[PDB]
């Protein structure tokens, strides 16, 4: 499946793309404003995730920091990025479908559109003004708008005995965007395209 990641934001990201325990084709590239950046992802590929990472420096080696989305401190990302990172999630050819969805529950840093290039399936948005709304607790100084678990490790926010509930925390982020997942158990957001579909990522997809 080929993947076409745009970067429409007025200001440079760095794209990411892993599974978590390898890259996704080159892993890792900056976009400049009206960059694009086709990658290839392989089929049967289960729990893709694409997201941006912003105000990044980089060297020679690609080692350096990134303030939001950071990857381990390398530009080519292996693993996943540090929260908060809007992210787009995907599985690839299972029993002949793809799915795919748009998360906030590591966070939101970036708008995000994501939608098919070929037929068969709706697009998800989340485009909102996230960050410039997020409540007092869960701005993060480098930017962005952290999820409630990582800033309050509890049992409620992380999910982590598999019950729990919506919080006020989760209804920011689902009234701003109710096609995104807001937390752990939220109703999915998924959607079913074919299999081997062809998609889109693209960053600040209004503004």
Same mark, same amino acid.
């Given at each position: 499946?080929?993947?076409?990641?745009? &970067?429409?934001?007025? +200001?440079?990201?760095?794209?990411?793309?892993?599974?978590?325990?390898?890259?996704?084709?080159?892993?890792?590239?900056? %976009?400049?404003?009206?960059?694009?950046?086709?990658?290839?992802?392989? $089929?049967? /590929? &289960?729990?893709?995730?694409?997201?941006? *990472?912003?105000?990044? +420096?980089?060297?020679?080696?690609?080692?350096?920091?990134?303030?939001?989305?950071?990857?381990?401190?390398?530009? *080519?990302?292996?693993?996943?990025?540090? $929260? $908060?990172?809007?992210?787009?999630?995907? =599985?690839?050819?299972?029993?002949? @479908?793809? +799915?795919?969805?748009?998360?906030?529950?590591?966070?939101? &840093?970036?708008?995000?559109?994501?939608? !098919? #290039? #070929?037929?068969?399936? *709706?697009?998800?948005?989340?485009?909102?003004?996230?960050?410039?709304?997020?409540?007092?607790?869960?701005?993060? !100084?480098?930017?962005?708008?952290?999820?409630?678990?990582?800033?309050?490790?509890? =049992?409620? +926010?992380?999910?982590?005995?598999? @019950?729990?509930? !919506?919080?006020?925390?989760?209804?920011?982020? @689902?009234?701003?965007? $109710?096609?995104?997942?807001?937390?752990? %158990?939220?109703?999915?957001?998924?959607?079913?395209?074919?299999?081997?579909?062809?998609? *889109?990522? /693209?960053?600040?997809?209004?503004?």
């Amino acid at each position: 499946a080929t993947f076409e990641i745009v &970067n429409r934001c007025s +200001y440079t990201v760095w794209a990411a793309a892993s599974k978590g325990d390898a890259a996704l084709d080159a892993g890792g590239r900056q %976009l400049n404003s009206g960059e694009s950046w086709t990658i290839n992802v392989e $089929p049967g /590929t &289960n729990g893709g995730k694409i997201w941006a *990472r912003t105000d990044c +420096y980089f060297d020679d080696s690609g080692s350096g920091i990134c303030k939001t989305g950071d990857c381990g401190g390398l530009l *080519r990302c292996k693993r996943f990025g540090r $929260p $908060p990172t809007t992210l787009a999630e995907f =599985s690839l050819n299972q029993y002949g @479908k793809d +799915y795919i969805d748009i998360s906030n529950i590591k966070g939101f &840093n970036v708008p995000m559109n994501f939608s !098919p #290039t #070929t037929r068969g399936c *709706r697009g998800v948005r989340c485009a909102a003004d996230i960050v410039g709304q997020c409540p007092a607790k869960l701005k993060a !100084p480098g930017g962005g708008c952290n999820d409630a678990c990582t800033v309050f490790q509890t =049992s409620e +926010y992380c999910c982590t005995t598999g @019950k729990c509930g !919506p919080t006020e925390y989760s209804r920011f982020f @689902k009234r701003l965007c $109710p096609d995104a997942f807001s937390y752990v %158990l939220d109703k999915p957001t998924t959607v079913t395209c074919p299999g081997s579909s062809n998609y *889109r990522v /693209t960053f600040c997809p209004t503004a």
